[PDB]
Amino acid sequence: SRRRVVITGMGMLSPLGLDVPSSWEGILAGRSGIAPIEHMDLSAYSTRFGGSVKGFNVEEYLSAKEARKLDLFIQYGLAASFQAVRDSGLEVTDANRERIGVSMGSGIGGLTNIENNCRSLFEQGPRRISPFFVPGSIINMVSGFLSIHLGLQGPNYALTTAQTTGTHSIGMAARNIAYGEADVMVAGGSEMAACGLGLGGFGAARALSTRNDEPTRASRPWDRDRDGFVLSDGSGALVLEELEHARARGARIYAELVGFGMSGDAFHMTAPPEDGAGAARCMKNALRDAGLDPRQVDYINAHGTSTPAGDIAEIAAVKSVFGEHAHALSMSSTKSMTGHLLGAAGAVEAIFSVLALRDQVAPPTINLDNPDEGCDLDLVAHEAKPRKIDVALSNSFGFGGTNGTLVFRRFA
């Protein structure tokens, strides 16, 4: 048997807002965070738009000196983490610092830093590479820097499971607390891949929407005219906490993390199976982990990335796991509004799933103008839907066929 895990703090940078409540207001109003990308020449690229974090002020969190040493994805992850810890009200002491850890991950990490240092290396040679290039670029430095700044001496790691990273980071943090390896974890992910190599890389695989003329309409999960995902930047972080620890200090509890599932498709490098059999097993695993019948699920935050093969495979998976109940639950992709934050997608979508529980409302899938063949579930087309939500699922699936499901429940 196993300790209960609750959510006491949340923090976020997204294309919709510089914090959770601004982002969540965006979500419920159906607002897009997608725009042509600025201060960067995309003439030669097939995709010129994405979800940028707008007006980020790193000096609310770090000195100019510390910020200069760190890739944007690390800055974004620390901002989300500080917000989350602040939101939790947690006081770190000598009594508890050994019981507080971090698992903040990234899918692709320091690409902007790697770009900038590559320029220096090619143009001038290795003597112009920054001394902080290595520590300032590696994916575990959100966990590293946060632990140094707050004096966190608990489990310290980072997951990198491509587009599953955020979901996996929160799940494995939850396991640390459940099995008594920590009382508190800060978990989630951060990503900044809106550079040459990210838009170029995903663009070369023709994975991206090229709807340059209508950026806010590019991300249209399960719509018949979808043409690939929209690349987005940001971060999400949650304070996970053992229930008796939260209660003792009178912490405000948002929701309970009751279920985590994992699976591998063992199918293709960059496409799921057509029936989404891996997604199905992962969702099944998460529900068994929670001791929940598929019947109990009210809301699914879909992976729902606006790809042809991806979107249909997730519908097939949900129909398989849930049967006739798949038509009674509400499923939406918030990527319709935020785009695809890759490694940070599972973190910000775990937060939206928790807020769907707090506010009893399913966020919309915007741009769902003509549902494709088979896309006949309640996909919350166009507008937010107030409704009863006791249990909310959040799916992430990644290159390599790596799948993650979180199950959240209302607490009382």
34: β partners: 51
80 contacts 190 by C-beta, under 8 angstroms: yes
For ligand Q5H, the binding residues (CB under 6 A) are 163, 229, 265, 270-272, 303, 305, 307, 310, 397-399, 401
**Residue 121 dihedral angles phi and psi, to the nearest 5°:** -65, -50
Return the one option of ligand Q5H, a second copy, none that residue 97 interacts with (CB less than 5 to 8 A, by type).
a second copy
Tokens for 306? Answer: 């606006």
**Measured from the CB atom, is 9 or 215 closer to ligand Q5H?**
215
Nearest to 364 by CA among 331, 397, 399: 331
Return the one option of ligand Q5H, a second copy, none that residue 307 interacts with (CB less than 5 to 8 A, by type).
ligand Q5H
**Measured from the CB atom, is 136 or 363 closer to a second copy?**
136
- Name the H helices within 179-307: 196-204, 215-218, 243-248, 277-289
- Cβ 310 to ligand Q5H shortest distance, Å: 3
- Cβ 404 to ligand Q5H shortest distance, Å: 11
Tokens for 53? Answer: 């974090």
**Measured from the CB atom, is 135 or 294 closer to ligand Q5H?**
135
Give residue number: closest CB to ligand Q5H: 310
- Cβ 240 to ligand Q5H shortest distance, Å: 24
- Cβ 243 to ligand Q5H shortest distance, Å: 32
With H, G, I as helix, E, B as strand and everything else as coil, classify residue 407. strand
Nearest to 238 by CA among 105, 358, 101, 81: 81
279 contacts 32 by C-beta, under 8 angstroms: no
Tokens for 254? Answer: 């948002």
Q: Are strands 391-398 and 299-301 parallel, antiparallel or unpaired?
A: parallel
**Measured from the CB atom, is 56 or 73 closer to ligand Q5H?**
73
**Measured from the CB atom, is 130 or 156 closer to ligand Q5H?**
156
**Measured from the CB atom, is 115 or 244 closer to a second copy?**
115
Return the one option of ligand Q5H, a second copy, none that residue 40 interacts with (CB less than 5 to 8 A, by type).
none
Tokens 């770190």 identify what position? 92
Residue 168: in which H helix or E strand, if any? helix 165-178
- Cβ 45 to ligand Q5H shortest distance, Å: 18
Tokens 């390896």 identify what position? 181
Return the one option of a second copy, ligand Q5H, none that residue 133 interacts with (CB less than 5 to 8 A, by type).
a second copy
385: β partners: 362
- Cβ 18 to a second copy shortest distance, Å: 25
Q: Are strands 184-191 and 100-105 parallel, antiparallel or unpaired?
A: parallel
**Measured from the CB atom, is 35 or 138 closer to a second copy?**
138
- Cβ 281 to a second copy shortest distance, Å: 7
- Cβ 26 to a second copy shortest distance, Å: 28
With H, G, I as helix, E, B as strand and everything else as coil, classify residue 381. strand
Return the one option of ligand Q5H, a second copy, none that residue 155 interacts with (CB less than 5 to 8 A, by type).
a second copy
**Measured from the CB atom, is 141 or 393 closer to a second copy?**
141
207 contacts 320 by C-beta, under 8 angstroms: no
Return the one option of a second copy, ligand Q5H, none that residue 397 interacts with (CB less than 5 to 8 A, by type).
ligand Q5H
